[PDB]
Scaffold this active site. Structure first.
Site, short mmCIF file in Angstrom:
data_model
loop_
_atom_site.label_atom_id
_atom_site.label_comp_id
_atom_site.label_asym_id
_atom_site.label_seq_id
_atom_site.Cartn_x
_atom_site.Cartn_y
_atom_site.Cartn_z
N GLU A 191 -1.64 -4.71 -8.61
CA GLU A 191 -0.43 -4.71 -9.42
C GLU A 191 0.81 -4.59 -8.55
OE1 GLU A 191 -0.32 -5.87 -12.08
OE2 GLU A 191 -1.11 -4.73 -13.80
N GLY A 202 5.23 -7.66 -10.24
CA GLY A 202 4.25 -8.75 -10.19
C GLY A 202 2.82 -8.27 -10.08
N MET A 203 1.89 -9.19 -9.86
CA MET A 203 0.45 -8.87 -9.75
C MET A 203 -0.28 -9.86 -8.82
SD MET A 203 -2.30 -9.77 -12.70
CE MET A 203 -1.07 -9.82 -14.02
N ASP A 209 9.50 -1.23 6.85
CA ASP A 209 8.49 -0.65 5.90
C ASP A 209 7.12 -0.82 6.39
OD1 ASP A 209 7.89 0.98 3.67
OD2 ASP A 209 7.71 -0.82 2.40
N1 LIG Z 1 -2.77 -12.14 1.37
C1 LIG Z 1 -3.39 -11.17 0.66
N2 LIG Z 1 -4.74 -11.15 0.57
C2 LIG Z 1 -5.43 -10.22 -0.08
N3 LIG Z 1 -4.84 -9.18 -0.71
C3 LIG Z 1 -3.49 -9.05 -0.67
C4 LIG Z 1 -2.65 -10.03 0.02
N4 LIG Z 1 -1.36 -9.62 -0.14
C5 LIG Z 1 -1.43 -8.48 -0.87
N5 LIG Z 1 -2.70 -8.15 -1.19
C6 LIG Z 1 -3.29 -7.03 -2.00
O1 LIG Z 1 -3.05 -7.15 -3.42
C7 LIG Z 1 -2.73 -5.87 -4.02
C8 LIG Z 1 -1.27 -5.76 -4.49
O2 LIG Z 1 -0.48 -6.36 -3.45
P1 LIG Z 1 0.71 -5.63 -2.63
O3 LIG Z 1 1.69 -5.38 -3.75
O4 LIG Z 1 0.15 -4.44 -1.86
O5 LIG Z 1 1.23 -6.72 -1.50
P2 LIG Z 1 2.56 -6.57 -0.54
O6 LIG Z 1 2.84 -7.85 0.31
O7 LIG Z 1 2.36 -5.27 0.24
O8 LIG Z 1 3.76 -6.47 -1.67
P3 LIG Z 1 4.49 -5.15 -2.30
O9 LIG Z 1 5.93 -5.20 -1.82
O10 LIG Z 1 4.38 -5.34 -3.83
O11 LIG Z 1 3.64 -4.00 -1.79
C9 LIG Z 1 -3.00 -4.82 -2.95
O12 LIG Z 1 -4.33 -4.34 -3.09
C10 LIG Z 1 -2.81 -5.62 -1.64
O13 LIG Z 1 -3.48 -5.05 -0.49
#
Ligand SMILES: Nc1ncnc2c1ncn2[C@@H]1O[C@H](COP(=O)(O)OP(=O)(O)OP(=O)(O)O)[C@@H](O)[C@H]1O
Ligand SMILES: [Mg+2]
Ligand SMILES: [Mg+2]
EC number: 2.7.11.24
Length: 348
Positions: free
Chosen positions: A23, A27-28, A139
């Site tokens: 989540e 977004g998701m 970050d």
């Molecule tokens: N390229 C990817 N492949 C697999 N999992 C991903 C990828 N990008 C994000 N995720 C995973 O999907 C889930 C939600 O994504 P997440 O929000 O952590 O991504 P982010 O790039 O760190 O963006 P945010 O700013 O929302 O943290 C988490 O479990 C995360 O680890």
């Protein structure tokens, strides 16, 4: 149009047989099968247009990831959105599918010294490229380091990234901040806006400490508690380091604290490699001017098995000035998003 646990997830025809992953605030994330490339991919649904802050974050991350091209930074393979600005409500970002992130891996796995060395090498290799483009990530934290099944590591999440601006880094004591507390450099709390490269090296030092013990080193519960945690381990800053803090409020606050001696890193991490602790000490240096920079860290003996500066590329095209995003209304930011994603539209 396909749905996924609640809300619509509309990425056909190309992307099919999808599956929930996670989540966000707006977004998701799902995995999906990519019918052109015949591989599974990750797809992030973003719905940021109601909110200026979200539009900013989304634009920043899209503009940065589209211009970076490096093995240790997540790429954007595709972007799906409506063909017109009026019909665009959501944007889908397609990326390589990663097995896991470093946060999830560390909740359950002990890392071998060989893995810690290899992950640290890749994080600094990717950070060298980022800093070389004059960008600060801001970050860095285990959840923003993605890993695949063969332990390739890619840095992601450039939502809070900025162009470096050292001349305008100084601020007052206890000024509000955005990035994740446990990985924030001490100067953020004291007198820094986090506009210099040294703040990312501090977060990498916190990530190294966490790889060595599976626990955050400075898990502060709030804003000045984070600094207490820091000073409890590093000891009271020297007179020379305090002479570098001109702002009286921050200086006096540090002078008000009882004296604390350094806890040796080998007392904290008795199984750690001595070379890893020497590099840890240099990344977790209180004074940002004395803190090691990324290319020095790559050259440290701990990384000698991997170090090869000819295979540690830098950016071709640095950002000169920050995206003027402060600033722009939601509507202008939606138009820049629509424009930055145009290259992915059919034909073109
Ligand atoms: N390229 C990817 N492949 C697999 N999992 C991903 C990828 N990008 C994000 N995720 C995973 O999907 C889930 C939600 O994504 P997440 O929000 O952590 O991504 P982010 O790039 O760190 O963006 P945010 O700013 O929302 O943290 C988490 O479990 C995360 O680890
Ligand atoms: Mg993230
Ligand atoms: Mg190679």
């Amino acid at each position: 149009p396909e749905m996924v646990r609640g809300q619509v997830f509309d990425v056909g025809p190309r992307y099919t047989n999808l599956s929930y992953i996670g989540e966000g605030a707006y977004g998701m994330v799902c995995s999906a099968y990519d019918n052109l490339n015949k591989v599974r991919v990750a797809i992030k649904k973003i719905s940021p247009f109601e909110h200026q802050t979200y539009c900013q974050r989304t634009l920043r991350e899209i503009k940065i990831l589209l211009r970076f091209r490096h093995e240790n930074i997540i790429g954007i393979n595709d972007i799906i959105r409506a063909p017109t600005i009026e019909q665009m409500k959501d944007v889908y970002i397609v990326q390589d599918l990663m097995e896991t992130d470093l946060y999830k891996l560390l909740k359950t796995q002990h890392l071998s010294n060989d893995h810690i060395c290899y992950f640290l090498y890749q994080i600094l290799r990717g950070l060298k490229y980022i800093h070389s483009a004059n960008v600060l990530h801001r970050d860095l934290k285990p959840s923003n380091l993605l890993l695949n099944t063969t332990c390739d590591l890619k840095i992601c999440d450039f939502g809070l990234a900025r162009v470096a601006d050292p001349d305008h880094d100084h601020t007052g004591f206890l000024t509000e901040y955005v990035a994740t507390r446990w990985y924030r450099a001490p100067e953020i709390m004291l007198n820094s806006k986090g506009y210099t490269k040294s703040i990312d090296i501090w977060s990498v030092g916190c990530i190294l400490a966490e790889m060595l013990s599976n626990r955050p080193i400075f898990p502060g519960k709030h804003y000045l508690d984070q600094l207490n945690h820091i000073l409890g381990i590093l000891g009271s800053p020297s007179q020379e380091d305090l002479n570098c803090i001109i702002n009286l409020k921050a200086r006096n606050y540090l002078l008000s604290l009882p004296h604390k001696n350094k806890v040796p890193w080998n007392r904290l991490f008795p199984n750690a490699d001595s070379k890893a602790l020497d590099l840890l000490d240099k990344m977790l240096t209180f004074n940002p001017h004395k803190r090691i920079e990324v290319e020095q860290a790559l050259a440290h003996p701990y990384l000698e098995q991997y170090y090869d500066p000819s295979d540690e590329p830098i950016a071709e095209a640095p950002f000169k000035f920050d995206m003027e995003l402060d600033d722009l209304p939601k509507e202008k930011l939606k138009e820049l998003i629509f424009e930055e994603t145009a290259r992915f539209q059919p034909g073109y």
